[PDB]
Structures are given as C-alpha cells and as structure tokens.
Design a protein around this ligand. Structure first.
Ligand code: A1ARE
Length: 503
C-alpha cells in the first residue's frame, strides 16, 4: 500500500546535511541506544561488527526472555543462561559482569528462582556499554545513519503527507477521519478539530493541553499521538486507530449483560497499566467510562478521549466538577481538591459494570434522575451478587471507597498496590505488558462495530509540532521501510550517502 515513489521520499540525505543535527542531539545512552526505536536497532547492529560485544547483546536478550517465562519453567531457563553466558570458558562469556557477580548469582540458582534474578547482571552490562562501546558507536558509520533517520523524522508534515479515507467515527465539535500515510501505508485515526469552532468557543488552551498530554505519554494501553499538523481549515491529530469497537458495545450488545469474571480480569489488568502510564506523567484522566475503552484488531484495549485529561503539577491539587453523570467520584461531585484518586474510583466502576452488567449505582432497567444517582454515589453502599468472587468483591469495594484517602491505589504506593490485590492473583503483569497473554475476544477483521488574526498564529505554531519521535520511528520499522532502506555497503563499506568525499 506504499506510494509509487516512496523510496524517493524517504531517500536518505547526504551525511553532510546532518551536521547541525550532529551538533545539537544530546548524546544520552538510554535515549539513543534504547528508548528511540531506530537508534537502539542501529546500536545493536554496531555491536554485531565487534566480536567481543556480540555476547553482551545476546545475553540481555536471553534475560528479557527470562523475565517473562512462567514460574514453572524458570529453573531450566535460569540454568540455560548460566551454562552459556556466565561460565568462565563459555562460547559467549561475558567478562564485565565480574567473577564475583556470577559466583553470587551462580549460588542464587540454588534458591527459588526469581523472575528478576538477572537484574543485577544486566545492569552491570548496561554499565559497560554506556562507556567505551557507546562512544565508539558515536564515531561509527551507524550513528551517521541514525542522523540521516532523524533528518527524515524532522521533515515537515502537511496535508499531502497523508491520504484521508472514509470516515472512522464522528464527533459534534470535531470530525474523525482515517488519514493514511502515502509513503508507508500505515493506517491511523485523525481527530480533526476545526479552527472556527475552537476560536469562538475560546478553548485553544484545552486543545493544546490534550495534544501535549497525548504527545508525552507512550503506553501500549493509551492512544498515542503520531503527528500533529495544521491544514487550510483545521488542526489535525493523528492517533492510533482502533477497529475493534468499544467496551460498552461488548458489555451490553455482544456478551451477556456483563462478562465472565476471568474476562473482566484481562481488561481491568490492561486498563490499570494504561492508567499507571498516565500517572507516571502525574496526569489524571477523569473520563473513565466503558465507551472510551477501545479494542484494536488483535483484541487488546487502549484508553481514548483524553480531552478531559489534566496534568497535575507534582505536590499540588486541582479543582473541577467534570466528567459524565454516573462515573464521577464523590470528591469530584463535591468540587473538592483532588489528585489522581478519581481514576481509581472509575476503575472500580468498570470492573463492577463488566462483571454485573450494570452500573453500581444505577440499574440497567431503572429510570432515575441525575439527582438521585448522585445521592447514591455519595451515600449508599453498592451491592454484589454471586457473579463476584470474594476477591472481586474486595477490590471493587476498596476502589469504590467513598473517602479518597482510604481508597485503594490512592496511597504513596500508586498502581503497585492495585496489582498486588488478590483479585489479580492469577495475573502475570510481566507477560501482559510484554503482550503475550492471548486476549479473550478477537474481532473479525471484516466486522463493523457501530477569520484570521495574529494571536492565533502563535497558538498554531505551538500545536503543529509535526511528527512524534518514538511513534514515527516505530512506523518506519513496522512497515519494513527501515528494513528496506537501511542498507549499507557490500562487506561493511561506506555507502555513497555516508561518504563525505563525493556527494
Ligand atoms: C471497524 O469497525 C469498528 C467500528 C466500526 N469503528 C471503531 O471502533 C472506531 C473507529 C474506526 N475509530 C474509532 C475512534 C478512535 C480510534 O480508533 N482511535 C481513537 C483515538 C482517540 C479518539 C478520541 O479521542 N475521541 C474523542 C471522543 C473525540 C473528541 C472530539 C472529537 C473527536 C474525537 C478516538 C479514536 C473507533 C472507536
């Protein structure tokens, strides 16, 4: 599905064009060689040329496989890594680990294997690579290639860059298009916000707050921002596409009025991880309802509609009686000062609704005014049925604690205190975050689950920042554009674009 001339668009620039990039990019190990997807691949490719560095990459890979193995197979896996990497005369022996550190972990196998056993060793490895190996890579041709990729990442994005297919949902104050990148063939979802509506409504600050919150969070369970451009009539937001429906449709139309507890377990586990990634940026969501939980092609879920999200400054509280009738925590209803607690109250509502088939404070077959449902959220205690195990009852009651100070997860521990609840006793988060627990429902691919000033010029420049670094690099990799274009010379020789003699 790539454009006819895609190899011309993503054609590498001559390395001489990247001198300004070379002079300004910060040379941080974690960023260049790990966080940035393409940088990490280029650094690992550099270690393949050095015979002595190959073993360190293979070792860290095998440790990544160990962390995720299930407990009934860590003994044999822990042994396999020992006799291949940590024995003295091994085929691929690691030396910078230290004979004292291997002798310390060698006898740590004698005890109940830990999922994070090799954390000490792996960190000692990163210690070594941060030093000489990293500074050599900086003076290698692979880093010159990295600069070429950054030069492309930085190119301007416009209406031409994309290709709008038929609608993909709609909104009153903002359309939702399809937008596909012509050059790579990658699908997205556009959140077109026209300028005329926002200008007169005076919400420019709330459209920026949403764009920036989406830009900073990078989670497997929240919709990610990939591009932000302005067109001749609107400001656009290119986000992750979900073609699997929303959780409300699957609770009430697809499944019984509700789900099996084990199936609600899976979705709650992913939502919790989604909320945890937002809380790392000390950003609160406050819009947690079944409709905003979306399923993708594979069956996993992401949180959507961050328009009511707000980034709390560390150590401070905010006020705001916002949200949706029936999913607002008591501290929000009372217009008090709150932090992240509204999001754990929401999680309680979602787990309950998934298991029971109705809201904890409103019956599915009940007609109640918006004044009584609120009184219930503030006064009455919810009730449970035989659909809930004792574990399920517990976590819901603790999350639905009226007093936000005794509410589960609203302590100094954070989301960790929630992953520890007996409700998730049979859940292995390491494997869930690695994405190798099969979802309980897989959507069929063929399914369909449904005028100018100057003060605006400065606001538009702050919004239309262009492509987002990590999502863009991931796109290049997924579409195999990196595999095809990332071509060096025969027998480790400098290609033309990387030779400063003849441009
Ligand atoms: C293929 O059949 C499945 C059925 C027919 N369609 C869907 O499930 C299906 C499709 C195609 N797009 C979406 C929708 C999305 C998506 O995908 N990603 C995202 C990321 C972020 C939002 C988001 O913030 N919105 C808020 C409310 C908003 C506010 C104001 C204006 C516009 C939008 C929405 C989406 C959905 C569910």
């Amino acid at each position: 599905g790539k454009s006819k001339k895609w190899k011309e668009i993503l054609k590498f620039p001559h390395i001489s064009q990247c001198e300004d990039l070379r002079r300004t990019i910060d040379r941080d190990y974690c960023s260049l060689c790990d966080k940035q997807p393409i940088g990490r691949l280029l650094f690992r490719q550099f270690c393949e040329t050095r015979p002595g560095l190959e073993c360190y990459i293979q070792f860290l890979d095998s440790v990544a496989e160990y962390e995720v193995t299930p407990d009934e197979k860590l003994g044999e896996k822990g042994k396999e890594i020992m006799t291949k990497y940590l024995t003295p005369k091994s085929p691929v022996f690691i030396a910078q680990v230290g004979q004292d550190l291997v002798s310390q972990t060698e006898e740590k196998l004698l005890q109940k294997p830990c999922k994070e056993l090799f954390s000490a060793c792996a960190q000692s490895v990163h210690e070594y690579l941060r030093g000489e190996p990293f500074h050599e890579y900086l003076d290698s041709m692979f880093f010159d290639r990295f600069l070429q990729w950054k030069w492309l990442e930085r190119q301007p994005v416009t209406k031409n860059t994309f290709r709008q297919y038929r609608v993909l949902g709609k909104g009153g104050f903002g359309e939702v298009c399809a937008c596909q990148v012509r050059a790579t063939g990658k699908m997205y979802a556009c959140k077109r916000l026209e300028k005329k509506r926002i200008k007169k409504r005076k919400g420019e600050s709330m459209a920026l707050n949403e764009k920036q919150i989406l830009e900073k969070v990078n989670s497997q369970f929240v919709v990610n921002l990939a591009y932000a451009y302005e067109t001749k009539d609107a400001l656009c937001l290119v986000l992750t596409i979900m073609n699997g429906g929303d959780l409300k449709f699957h609770i009430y139309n697809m499944g019984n009025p509700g789900f099996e507890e084990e199936r609600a377990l899976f979705y709650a586990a992913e939502i919790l991880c989604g909320l945890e990634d937002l809380h790392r940026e000390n950003t609160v969501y406050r819009n947690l309802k079944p409709e905003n939980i979306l399923l993708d092609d594979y069956g996993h879920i992401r949180i959507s509609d961050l328009g009511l999200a707000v980034k709390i400054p560390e150590g401070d509280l905010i006020r705001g009686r916002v949200g949706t009738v029936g999913y607002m925590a008591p501290e929000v209803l009372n217009n008090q000062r709150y932090g992240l607690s509204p999001d754990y109250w929401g999680l309680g509502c979602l787990i309950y609704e998934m298991i029971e088939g109705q809201s904890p404070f409103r019956g599915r077959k009940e007609k109640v005014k918006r004044e009584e449902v609120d009184r219930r959220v503030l006064e009455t205690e919810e009730v449970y049925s035989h659909k809930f195990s004792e574990e399920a009852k517990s976590i819901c009651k603790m999350l639905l604690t009226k007093d936000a100070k005794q509410r589960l997860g609203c302590q100094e521990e954070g989301a960790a205190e929630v992953k520890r609840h007996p409700f998730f006793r049979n859940m292995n988060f390491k494997r869930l975050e690695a994405g190798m627990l099969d979802p309980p429902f897989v959507p069929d691919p063929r399914a369909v689950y449904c005028n100018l000033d100057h003060t605006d010029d400065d606001f538009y420049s702050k919004f239309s920042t262009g492509s987002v670094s990590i999502p863009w690099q991931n796109e290049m990799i997924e579409t195999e554009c990196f595999k095809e274009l990332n071509v060096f010379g025969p027998n480790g020789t400098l290609p033309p674009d990387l030779n400063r003699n003849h441009p």
